[PDB]
Coordinates of C-alpha atoms and ligand atoms in Angstrom, one line a residue:
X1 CA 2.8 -9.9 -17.0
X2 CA -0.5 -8.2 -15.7
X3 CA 0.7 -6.4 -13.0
X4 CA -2.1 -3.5 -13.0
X5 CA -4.4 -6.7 -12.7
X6 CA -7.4 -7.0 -9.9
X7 CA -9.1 -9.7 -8.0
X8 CA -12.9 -9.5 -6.5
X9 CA -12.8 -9.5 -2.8
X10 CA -16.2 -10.9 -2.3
X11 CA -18.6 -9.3 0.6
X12 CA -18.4 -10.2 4.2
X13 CA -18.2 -9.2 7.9
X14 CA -15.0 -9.4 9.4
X15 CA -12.9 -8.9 12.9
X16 CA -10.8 -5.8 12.2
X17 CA -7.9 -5.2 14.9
X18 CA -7.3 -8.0 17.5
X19 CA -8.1 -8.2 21.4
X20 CA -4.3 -9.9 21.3
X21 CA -2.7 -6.4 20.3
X22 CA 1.3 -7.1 20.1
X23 CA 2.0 -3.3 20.0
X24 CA -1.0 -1.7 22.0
X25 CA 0.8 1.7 21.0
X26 CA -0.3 1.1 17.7
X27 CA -4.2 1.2 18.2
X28 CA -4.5 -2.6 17.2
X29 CA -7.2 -3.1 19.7
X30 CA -10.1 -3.4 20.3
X31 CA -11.2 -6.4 17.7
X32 CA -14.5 -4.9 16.3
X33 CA -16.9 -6.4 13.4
X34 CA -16.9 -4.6 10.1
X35 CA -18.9 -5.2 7.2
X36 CA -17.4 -4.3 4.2
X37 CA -19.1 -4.7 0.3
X38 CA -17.7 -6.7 -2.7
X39 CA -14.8 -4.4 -3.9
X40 CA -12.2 -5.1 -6.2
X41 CA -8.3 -4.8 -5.0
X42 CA -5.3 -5.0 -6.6
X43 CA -3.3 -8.5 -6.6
X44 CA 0.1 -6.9 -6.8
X45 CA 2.0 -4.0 -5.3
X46 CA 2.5 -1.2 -8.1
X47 CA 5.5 -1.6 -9.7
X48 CA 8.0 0.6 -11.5
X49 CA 6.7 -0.3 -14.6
X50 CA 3.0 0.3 -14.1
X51 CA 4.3 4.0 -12.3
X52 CA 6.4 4.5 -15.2
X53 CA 3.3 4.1 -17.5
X54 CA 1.6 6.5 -15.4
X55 CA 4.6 9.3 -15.2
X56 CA 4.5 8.6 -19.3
X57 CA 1.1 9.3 -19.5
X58 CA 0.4 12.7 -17.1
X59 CA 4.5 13.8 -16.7
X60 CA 3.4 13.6 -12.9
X61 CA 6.4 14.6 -10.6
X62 CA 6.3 12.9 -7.4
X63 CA 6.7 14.8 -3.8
X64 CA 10.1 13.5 -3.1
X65 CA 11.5 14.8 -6.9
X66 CA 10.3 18.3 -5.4
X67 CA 11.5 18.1 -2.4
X68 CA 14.9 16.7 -3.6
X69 CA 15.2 14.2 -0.9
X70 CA 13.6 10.9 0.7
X71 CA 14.2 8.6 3.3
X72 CA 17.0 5.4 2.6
X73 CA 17.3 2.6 4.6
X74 CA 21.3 2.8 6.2
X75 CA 22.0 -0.7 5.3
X76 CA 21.4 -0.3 1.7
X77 CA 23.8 2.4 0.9
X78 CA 14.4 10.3 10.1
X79 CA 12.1 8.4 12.7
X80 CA 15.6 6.0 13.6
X81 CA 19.8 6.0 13.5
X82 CA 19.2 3.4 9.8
X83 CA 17.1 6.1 7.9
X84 CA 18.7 9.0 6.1
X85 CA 17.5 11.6 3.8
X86 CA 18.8 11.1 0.6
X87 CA 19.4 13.6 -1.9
X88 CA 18.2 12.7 -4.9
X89 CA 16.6 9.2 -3.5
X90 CA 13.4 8.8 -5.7
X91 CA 11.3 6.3 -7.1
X92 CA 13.9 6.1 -10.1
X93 CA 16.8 6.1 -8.1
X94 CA 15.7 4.5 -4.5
X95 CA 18.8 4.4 -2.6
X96 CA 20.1 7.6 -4.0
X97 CA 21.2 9.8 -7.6
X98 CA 23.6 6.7 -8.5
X99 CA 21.2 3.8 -8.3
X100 CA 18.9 2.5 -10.7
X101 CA 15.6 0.9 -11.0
X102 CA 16.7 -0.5 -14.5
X103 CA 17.0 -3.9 -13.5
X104 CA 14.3 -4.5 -11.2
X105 CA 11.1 -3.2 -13.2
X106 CA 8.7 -5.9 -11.9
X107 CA 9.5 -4.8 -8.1
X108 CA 7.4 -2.1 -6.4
X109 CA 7.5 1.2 -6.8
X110 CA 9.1 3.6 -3.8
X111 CA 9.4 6.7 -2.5
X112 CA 5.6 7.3 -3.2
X113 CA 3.5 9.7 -0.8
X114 CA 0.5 9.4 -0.4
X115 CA -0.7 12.1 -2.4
X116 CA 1.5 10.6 -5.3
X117 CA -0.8 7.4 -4.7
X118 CA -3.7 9.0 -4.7
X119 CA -2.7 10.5 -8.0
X120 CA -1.3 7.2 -9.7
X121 CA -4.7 4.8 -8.1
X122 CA -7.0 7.9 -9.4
X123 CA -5.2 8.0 -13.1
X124 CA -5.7 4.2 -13.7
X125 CA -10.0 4.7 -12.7
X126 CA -9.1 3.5 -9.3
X127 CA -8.6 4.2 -5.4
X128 CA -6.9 3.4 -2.6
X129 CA -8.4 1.3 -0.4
X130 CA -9.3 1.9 3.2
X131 CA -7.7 0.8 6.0
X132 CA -10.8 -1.7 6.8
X133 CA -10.9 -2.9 2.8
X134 CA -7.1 -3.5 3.2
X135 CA -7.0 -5.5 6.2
X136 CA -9.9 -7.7 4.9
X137 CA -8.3 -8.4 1.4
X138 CA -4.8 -9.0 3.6
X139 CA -6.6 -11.5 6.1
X140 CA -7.7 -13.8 2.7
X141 CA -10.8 -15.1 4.0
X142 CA -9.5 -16.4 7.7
X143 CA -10.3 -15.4 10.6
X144 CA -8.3 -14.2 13.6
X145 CA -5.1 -15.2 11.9
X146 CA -2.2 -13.6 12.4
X147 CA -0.8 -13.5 8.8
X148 CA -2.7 -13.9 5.2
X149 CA -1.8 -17.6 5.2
X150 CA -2.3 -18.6 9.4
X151 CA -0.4 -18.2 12.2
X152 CA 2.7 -20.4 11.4
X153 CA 5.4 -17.7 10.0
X154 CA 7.1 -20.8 8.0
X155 CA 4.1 -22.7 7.5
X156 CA 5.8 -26.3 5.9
X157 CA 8.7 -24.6 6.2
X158 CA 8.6 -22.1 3.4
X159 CA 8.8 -18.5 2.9
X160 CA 5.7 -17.0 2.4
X161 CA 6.7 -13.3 2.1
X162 CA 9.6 -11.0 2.1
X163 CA 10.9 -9.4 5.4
X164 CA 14.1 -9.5 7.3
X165 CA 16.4 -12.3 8.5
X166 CA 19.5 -11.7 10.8
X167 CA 20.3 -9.1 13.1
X168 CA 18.7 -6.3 12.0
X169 CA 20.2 -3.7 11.5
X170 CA 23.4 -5.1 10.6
X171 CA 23.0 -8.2 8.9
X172 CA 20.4 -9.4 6.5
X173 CA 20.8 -12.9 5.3
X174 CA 18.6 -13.0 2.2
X175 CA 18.1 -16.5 3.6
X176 CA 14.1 -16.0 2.2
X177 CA 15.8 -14.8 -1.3
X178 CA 15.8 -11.0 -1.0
X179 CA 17.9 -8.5 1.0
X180 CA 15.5 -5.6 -0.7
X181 CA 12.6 -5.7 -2.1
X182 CA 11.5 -8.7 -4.4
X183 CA 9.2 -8.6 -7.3
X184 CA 5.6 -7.8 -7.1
X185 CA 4.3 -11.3 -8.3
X186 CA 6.8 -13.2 -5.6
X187 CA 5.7 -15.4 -2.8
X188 CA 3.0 -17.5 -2.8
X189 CA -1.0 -15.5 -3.3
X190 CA -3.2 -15.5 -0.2
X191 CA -6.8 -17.0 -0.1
X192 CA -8.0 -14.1 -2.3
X193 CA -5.6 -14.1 -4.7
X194 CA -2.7 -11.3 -3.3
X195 CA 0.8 -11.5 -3.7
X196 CA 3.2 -9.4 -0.9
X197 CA 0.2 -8.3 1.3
X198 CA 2.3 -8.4 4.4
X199 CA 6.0 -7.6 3.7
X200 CA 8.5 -6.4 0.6
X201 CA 7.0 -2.5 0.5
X202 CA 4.3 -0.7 3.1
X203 CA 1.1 -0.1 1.6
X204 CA -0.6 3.0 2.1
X205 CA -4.5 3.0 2.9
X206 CA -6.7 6.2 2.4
X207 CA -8.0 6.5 6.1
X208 CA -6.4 9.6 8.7
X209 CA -4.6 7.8 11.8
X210 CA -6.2 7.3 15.2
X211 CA -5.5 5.2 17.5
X212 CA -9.0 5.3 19.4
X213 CA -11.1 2.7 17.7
X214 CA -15.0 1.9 19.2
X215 CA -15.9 -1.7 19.1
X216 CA -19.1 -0.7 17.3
X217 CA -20.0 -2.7 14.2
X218 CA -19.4 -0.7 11.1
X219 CA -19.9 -0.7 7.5
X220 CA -17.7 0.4 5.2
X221 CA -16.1 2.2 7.3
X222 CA -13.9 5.1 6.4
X223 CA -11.7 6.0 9.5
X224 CA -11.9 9.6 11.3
X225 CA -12.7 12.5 9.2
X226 CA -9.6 14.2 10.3
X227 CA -6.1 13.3 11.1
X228 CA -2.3 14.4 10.4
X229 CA -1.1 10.9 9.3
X230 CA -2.6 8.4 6.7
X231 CA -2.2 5.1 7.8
X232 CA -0.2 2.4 5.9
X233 CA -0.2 -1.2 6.5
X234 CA 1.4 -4.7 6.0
X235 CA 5.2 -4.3 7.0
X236 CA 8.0 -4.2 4.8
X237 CA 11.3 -6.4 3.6
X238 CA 12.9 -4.7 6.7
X239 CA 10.8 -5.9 9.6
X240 CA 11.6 -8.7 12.1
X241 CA 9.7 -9.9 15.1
X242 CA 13.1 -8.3 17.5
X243 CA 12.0 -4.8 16.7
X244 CA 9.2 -4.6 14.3
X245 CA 6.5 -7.3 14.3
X246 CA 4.6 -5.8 12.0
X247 CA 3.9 -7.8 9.2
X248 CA 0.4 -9.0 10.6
X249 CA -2.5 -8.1 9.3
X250 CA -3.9 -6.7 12.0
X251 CA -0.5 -4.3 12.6
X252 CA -0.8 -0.6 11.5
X253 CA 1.9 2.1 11.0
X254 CA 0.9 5.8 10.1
X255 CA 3.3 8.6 8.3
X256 CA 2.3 12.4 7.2
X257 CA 0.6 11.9 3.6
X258 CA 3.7 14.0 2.0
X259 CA 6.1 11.6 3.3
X260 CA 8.2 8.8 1.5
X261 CA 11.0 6.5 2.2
X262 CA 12.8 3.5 0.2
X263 CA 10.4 0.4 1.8
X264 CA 7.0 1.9 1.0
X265 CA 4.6 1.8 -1.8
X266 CA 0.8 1.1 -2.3
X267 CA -1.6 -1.0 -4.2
X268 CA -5.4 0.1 -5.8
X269 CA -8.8 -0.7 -5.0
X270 CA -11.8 -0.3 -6.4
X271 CA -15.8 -0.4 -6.0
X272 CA -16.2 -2.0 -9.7
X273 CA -13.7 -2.9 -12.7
X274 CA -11.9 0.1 -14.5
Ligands
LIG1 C1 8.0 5.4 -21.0 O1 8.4 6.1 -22.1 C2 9.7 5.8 -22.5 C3 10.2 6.9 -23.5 O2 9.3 6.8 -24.6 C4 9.7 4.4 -23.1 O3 11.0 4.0 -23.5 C5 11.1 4.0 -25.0 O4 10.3 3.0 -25.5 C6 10.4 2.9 -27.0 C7 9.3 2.1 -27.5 O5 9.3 0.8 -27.1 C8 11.8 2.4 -27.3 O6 11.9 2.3 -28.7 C9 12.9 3.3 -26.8 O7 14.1 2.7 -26.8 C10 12.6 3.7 -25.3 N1 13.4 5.0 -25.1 C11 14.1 5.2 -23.9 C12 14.6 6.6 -23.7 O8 14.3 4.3 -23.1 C13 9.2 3.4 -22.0 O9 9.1 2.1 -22.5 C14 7.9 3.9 -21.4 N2 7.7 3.1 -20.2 C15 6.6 2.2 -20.1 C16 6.6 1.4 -18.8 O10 5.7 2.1 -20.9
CA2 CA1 13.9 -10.6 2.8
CA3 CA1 3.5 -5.2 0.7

């Protein structure tokens, strides 16, 4: 295992966003040309081990410990009917005080906010990426594609990452091997070298929500310099095309940065090797 392990994501210019929004709420339009620097991102999710290292090291109590609560998917015992607060739902305990993470230490971690991101990325001499970095490293060196690998969900009819099957909400099949969320180092590594980019846990990026983007060319750009929400990105083991198609690259889903629920997490960036 090197699961705090990081690829280079070499320099290039890019189309960010799509003029083919599927959810024009979302601010996925318009398409717009960014330029973004060689950077180096994580290839996995964080997982429970690599937090547990970092809770080891600092003692670091996450937002949803305080609080005493955080947001569980229905299914696997709030913005819909299918999330609850939890008491006691945690990264340790992620569907409540009488589950476990003892058997799944190689999946990612949950029930992360941002600010407990910020703190883990900033305690292992990295960062969170922006939402422009992210969407690069996700698109793996194609262009215009809808997912890291093309546009073919299935290409050759394999699984190439970990969301829902069935009728969500009330039936998932597992038919692409996990009901929840799957290890970090699952599925096959898009053309950079990342494993789960799209799918098993949201990722949070460091950039404030907006939905108003200019078509401007940009470098390195940041996002707006204010904001309620922090956007995350990538989709989750929960979404399907019938209500949640958002396990594009281009897709984009925001939260307030204190929030946390049971299918998001977060990976590191950052601008040279720790
Ligand atoms: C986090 O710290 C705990 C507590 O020290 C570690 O668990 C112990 O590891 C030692 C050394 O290998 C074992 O001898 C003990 O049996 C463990 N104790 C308990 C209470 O489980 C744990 O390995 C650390 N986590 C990580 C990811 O490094
Ligand atoms: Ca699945
Ligand atoms: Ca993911």
């Amino acid at each position: 295992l090197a699961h705090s392990k990081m690829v280079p994501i070499p320099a290039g210019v890019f189309t960010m966003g799509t003029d083919d929004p599927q959810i024009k709420q979302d601010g996925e339009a318009p398409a717009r040309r960014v330029t973004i620097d060689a950077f180096y991102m994580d290839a996995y999710e964080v997982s429970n081990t690599e937090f547990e290292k970092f809770v080891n090291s600092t003692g670091y109590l996450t937002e949803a410990e305080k609080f005493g609560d955080s947001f569980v998917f229905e299914g696997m015992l709030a913005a819909a009917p299918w999330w609850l607060p939890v008491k006691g739902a945690n990264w340790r305990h992620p569907e409540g005080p009488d589950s476990t993470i003892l058997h799944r230490p190689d999946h990612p971690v949950l029930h992360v906010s941002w600010n407990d991101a910020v703190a883990y990325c900033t305690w292992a001499g990295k960062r969170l990426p922006t939402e422009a970095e992210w969407e690069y490293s996700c698109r793996g060196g194609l262009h215009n594609r809808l997912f890291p690998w093309g546009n073919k969900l299935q290409p050759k009819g394999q699984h190439y990452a970990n969301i829902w099957q069935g009728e969500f909400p009330v039936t998932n099949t597992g038919e692409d091997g996990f009901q929840g969320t799957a290890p970090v180092d699952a599925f096959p590594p898009n053309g950079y070298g990342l494993y789960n980019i799209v799918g098993n846990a949201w990722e949070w990026t460091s950039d404030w929500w907006t939905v108003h983007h200019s078509v401007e060319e940009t470098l390195n750009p940041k996002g707006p310099p204010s904001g309620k929400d922090r956007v995350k990105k990538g989709g989750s083991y929960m979404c399907h095309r019938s209500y949640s198609y958002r396990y594009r690259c281009a897709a984009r889903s925001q939260n307030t940065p204190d929030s946390s629920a049971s299918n998001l997490g977060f990976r590191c960036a950052a601008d040279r090797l720790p």
